[PDB]
Design a protein around this ligand. Structure first.
Ligand SMILES: *[C@@H](O)[C@H](C[C@@H]1CCNC1=O)NC(=O)[C@H](Cc1ccccc1)NC(=O)/C=C/c1ccc(N(C)C)cc1
Length: 181
């Protein structure tokens, strides 16, 4: 088996978890220690279902930029038994585009799912369901409901978390390594 599939499957085993909140099913990316990231609109509460058990959330931080605008990312600290493998090194230091990226999803309804979103380009401002968001990127793929929190990945880099789509295109919140310092 080659390196790109090995990388994604290893993400699916060690960092990319099936979750459910009151808002439905999402993919959650565990980044290091007991710190994970979800799309803000998943609205995690005091507990979250993670695969096979209910896990307590010890803190949730909704990220905004210096203008006060939503980044659509919520960092949660979990009462998990074990620490995540630290994947912060795979997150670029600036928000970064990619060629021929794949969106890797993992929910109870869409387990171990691979979506060929393709080139990922800078987008910036997005108004989704009424809320302004900054720092997004875009792919010309018709993503659908249930795929939020999916991990946008390319050549060993974890670059984005899926947050929205308009039927023809998909959008992620860009990831940068400093969100997880
Ligand atoms: C994941 O939960 C989901 C994935 C979307 C659903 C449709 N395709 C996808 O890829 N995301 C959403 O439903 C988001 C949620 C959101 C809320 C607030 C801030 C950021 C994200 N919303 C959307 O993707 C918007 C969908 C939409 C609304 C209205 C229209 N009409 C045509 C104006 C089109 C699309």
């Amino acid at each position: 088996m080659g390196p790109s599939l090995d990388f994604a499957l290893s993400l699916l085993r060690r960092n990319v978890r099936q979750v459910q909140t009151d808002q439905g099913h999402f993919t959650m990316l565990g980044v290091r220690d007991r710190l994970a990231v979800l799309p803000r609109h998943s609205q995690p509460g005091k507990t979250i279902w993670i695969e096979h058990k209910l896990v307590n959330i010890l803190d949730a931080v909704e990220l905004v930029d210096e203008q006060g605008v939503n980044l659509e990312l919520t960092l949660i600290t979990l009462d998990t038994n074990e620490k995540f493998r630290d994947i912060t090194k795979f997150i670029p230091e600036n928000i970064s585009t990619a060629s021929d990226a794949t969106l890797v999803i993992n929910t109870e309804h869409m387990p171990s799912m691979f979506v060929p979103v393709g080139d990922v380009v800078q987008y910036g401002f997005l108004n989704l369901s009424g809320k302004p968001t900054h720092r997004t990127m875009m792919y010309n793929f018709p993503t659908k409901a249930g795929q939020c929190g999916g991990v946008v990945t390319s050549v060993g880099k974890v670059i984005g978390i899926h947050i929205g789509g308009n039927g023809r295109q998909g959008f992620c919140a860009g990831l940068k390594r400093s969100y997880f310092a």
